[PDB]
Amino acid sequence: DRPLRPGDPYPLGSNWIEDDDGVNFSLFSENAEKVELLLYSLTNQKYPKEIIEVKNKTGDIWHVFVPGLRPGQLYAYRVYGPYKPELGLRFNPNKVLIDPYAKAINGSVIWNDAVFGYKIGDQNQDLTYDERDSGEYVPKSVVINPYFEWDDEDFIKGKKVPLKDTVIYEVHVKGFTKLRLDLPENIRGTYEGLASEQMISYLKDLGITTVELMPVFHFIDQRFLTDKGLTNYWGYDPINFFSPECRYSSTGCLGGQVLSFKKMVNELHNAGIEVIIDVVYNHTAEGNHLGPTLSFRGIDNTAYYMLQPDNKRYYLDFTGTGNTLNLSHPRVIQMVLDSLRYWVTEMHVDGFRFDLAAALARELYSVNMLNTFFIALQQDPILSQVKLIAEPWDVGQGGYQVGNFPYQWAEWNGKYRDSIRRFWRGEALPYSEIANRLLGSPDIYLGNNKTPFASINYVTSHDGFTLEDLVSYNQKHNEANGFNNQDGMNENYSWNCGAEGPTNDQNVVICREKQKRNFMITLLVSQGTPMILGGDELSRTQRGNNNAFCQDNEITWFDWNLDERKSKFLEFVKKMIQFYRAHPAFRRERYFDVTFYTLEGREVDEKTWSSPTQLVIFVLEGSVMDEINMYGERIADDSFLIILNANPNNVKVKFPKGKWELVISSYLREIKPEERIIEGEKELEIEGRTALVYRRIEL
């Protein structure tokens, strides 16, 4: 007998209107017989306060306005339909579902046989129909207040840092500040903790421009992970594409995660720092048949999911996770684009990084959506300005297969990390190959973007070894993950430097520290936008675990100990990053000028260019670049000489023309007077496994 009204279809989800004093509720469902809105009082989460049958429907969209409800109000849905699993029809109104357009989720799921929708349990498995209510264990979607006081006016509008000037920083929200002891407990390893005053000055002192946060979409710890006493630490199982992860909130989970995130981002922008978020669109946490009925599968399984034709009880898997969104259906492709748009206009994120992007492109291609998906990004008013990061993929015949890539499109260059790892390991590599990597990989980027900065260079990431573990480790040690070490990449191209794991041997440590420095300069001397693994500066180690996706503990937390070894390296990284930012010679837009050299100090003819090498010498020649980014003012950078000696043996190099001055090197030892400045082609005795950078000073 309530003054309820039909309300509006737009926008999707729950919408608090100031004026009409109440909240518009809307949910997409094509195959539902009946929809029910459930409102929960903070005090009781087991049974709804009030149940409202949603009776008005515009096209495939159910909606009702409900007066008097306000920001902070908990809710959920029960969706009604046929249950013929063999037809992919899995409607179970006993299961209390998460709104797909929820902007916040009030906690985690509590693993119990009743969140499944089939009997466990039974031997028909997914054919059966479980009657138990799920509400007791399913967090509720939350109505939020979208309003926020942004004074990142300077930043947002309009001209932020481009990829040519970007240093990215891949960092887990929790691990970053979990053991930053000069922060109060409740904000340690949280969004607010991350953007705190000292954290900001730290990231500023390091010199990184762009933060890449690991998954912040609200994810779910897998059953098989919690049965073993482990959580999903990396967050690669979204259940909702609009809500900040409740776990990383310092200010609670009834809007607090939205507010803290919005806060954190605003601080970061004011400091001059960009936010990229790692995003998963290739699968949902619901898994395959057999997985839980938490949201999509309950709302409309047939839409939403890619089903096996001829056996619709099964889900198509391109990723090995269990499901694929039905990206051909206009609502599903809408949700993705709606997600991307939300996070930019409302959460003020500067761009995205697509996890398993080769898979994501395969899925899109699967239903003829890849090129249209790209056109959607390019013409969209807000989406065509953000940064979009992915990976190479040849599908399936398959060269990219794509009319045109967004202006700020870039790809993780795994070939760059492999080549670089192998080089410093001692593997003599074709000169042309190692050199191309340093030149930003024009052999990969013929007509993908016409810029070196489409290539995201890196030596380490969240995947596999931490730069510390890379130089200390020959094979993975992932028994802690509980997969009897079968999980995680096996090709690592690593080297322990003479001892596996921690050692007392100062010969081994000298190798290691020297080597870390080698990679750090190789990376910040190459064309392409570089990405650094958070922790690498702190000499962070997961002690041989190369796939710590499930270690929310001591192993993964950043260790803020001021050990002198560690400290001295943090000093090196700072100095090198600074050097990179300080010189647009290593940051060219059009390379797709240099001169490469031999041991005996001459130019490089074919054969020399084609035979494996262990030593790279080259000069960034010239200066006049166009510009800078301001009205008609060309600058000129100093000319540099880079010597990289991976050959494990001392070697004698003939320098090229002019005066050269050593600006930085991997020598841990003090620098001899005849090494600071060198002229007139006279030879220097270069140590084995050493990297060196010189600027010319005349003429």
Place this chain on the structure above:
Amino acid sequence: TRDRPLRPGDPYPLGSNWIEDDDGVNFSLFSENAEKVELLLYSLTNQKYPKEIIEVKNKTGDIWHVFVPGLRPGQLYAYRVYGPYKPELGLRFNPNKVLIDPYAKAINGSVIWNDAVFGYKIGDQNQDLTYDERDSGEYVPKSVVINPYFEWDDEDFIKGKKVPLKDTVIYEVHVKGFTKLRLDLPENIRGTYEGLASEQMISYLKDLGITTVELMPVFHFIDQRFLTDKGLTNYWGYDPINFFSPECRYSSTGCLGGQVLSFKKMVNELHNAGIEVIIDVVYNHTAEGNHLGPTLSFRGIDNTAYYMLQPDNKRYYLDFTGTGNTLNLSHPRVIQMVLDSLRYWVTEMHVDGFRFDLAAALARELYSVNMLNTFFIALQQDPILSQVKLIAEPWDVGQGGYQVGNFPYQWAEWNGKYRDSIRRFWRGEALPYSEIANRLLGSPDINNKTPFASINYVTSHDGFTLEDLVSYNHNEANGFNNQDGMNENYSWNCGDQNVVICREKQKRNFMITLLVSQGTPMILGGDELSRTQRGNNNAFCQDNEITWFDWNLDERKSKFLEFVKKMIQFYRAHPAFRRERDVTFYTLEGREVDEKTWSSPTQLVIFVLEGDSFLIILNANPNNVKVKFPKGKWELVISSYLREIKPEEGEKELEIEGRTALVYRR
């Protein structure tokens, strides 16, 4: 170089953009192939000569941009683009030619024609390969930096319920014609946005009972040289040169930003009234025509991009419409422009829907480059564009069918043939009985294929109106031997007053049938005022007495308006004609339908709604036939009539007359 001081600015939003903090204007322009770009600043008095030449020196990707401090709304600019001139490669960049900004939100006047606006020596052996030298400044209208802000009070009608397609009655109306000869209104708002929006209109139209107004073209369009030389002016707007500017011609308040202002207010009134605005867009060609075309904008900015060139002879331009060019919809910026323009007119100009002219050709052009379906996905997923009404025509493209996954959620189509069908049953000729039974049903044999998706229109902006063929049963003024427009609209001659008896019965008829049909109906503007074109069915260059709405009541109109008002009133009163379907039916006489009968080429239709219940009888026809009502009580409400109502016309026998149509209730 120059001064000035100049902030590089931002690449987005495309166009001129004044920022009221840095107290300047931001300029951004696309040109993938440009060598050099020069912004030209102009004083509102000197236009032959540019006040300032500014070298646009920064580009982000394929967007040139510069920020100029000090400039504000009202500023007149144009661009100059340098690059190769190898017209055999399709490359035809010409600095001497002053170009409009494709993203300009306002333009100052029409093109003053001259040999200089072309990029080749207008007269020569190799027309369209030759390099013309002449400056184009004076002739080419200037792009105007605009005043974006505007105060909307229709917040109440913006959201939410805008009159749904079910409840809709649409009214197709040309802007000038609507109130040019509407004398009781000042001598400067007549034939303007604000004129159409006078408080004497609106009260008129709300009084008339239509809930949606569909304007003929308002995209700033030019004149065909190439016609005016015949002393005619493009009066239909179906030849645009920019996609963001309201047409200069229909502004009561000048052409330096008053087109923007007059249009917005227009809408804001219409909305407060409680009515809906749909505008008539053209995206299938620009006003530049083929090679041998004026170099106004896109040809000059970037010919490669923008235009679909003939492979093997990029000299020439692929034409799908017979107008000379097609936009290169496969280039991301070109497709972006179209989608930006659709988004602009909605969020910014508060427009409720579009009607794509020559939709099939547009679908085909889109198809030609694999963009049709991706165009449709873009529209559905767009937060603003998916909410608006969208109106085209049917088409059969590529390899059969529509070649589209899904349509937008308020898609509808000009039923090209429902008018060829209703104008043939009433016409008298041999006509099938499941055919016209279909037309009235919603035409469900073809989209969402739920009746609302059909635009049941008896009359388009196409001809006639209403009768005016039936007169025909006048393409001489249009200076080309009378072969232009449709070939037969299927009408009587009705040939006095005793040799014109059917005229008023060849009105009211279409009316009573059209409003009774399931779906959504379209009247031509001023068929209730009994409009006329003195015979013309193709009045596209008639800015004359021919087209302008004759508002002085000749006496036999005015009775008819009071009919249409009451006729449409009925459909605006009962949910019995607003569904996705309980229909009846009844042949002569009294007899519930069978299969003879179902395919019999004659002139008799009856039906009922159970299903407020209603009985409806409709017939053609050359002579009288026996009439018997069916099961249930019958009470008259409205009709067509040779005289008036007498007398008193369960179950019995009437019996009905000739050229005529009729109705009842329960």
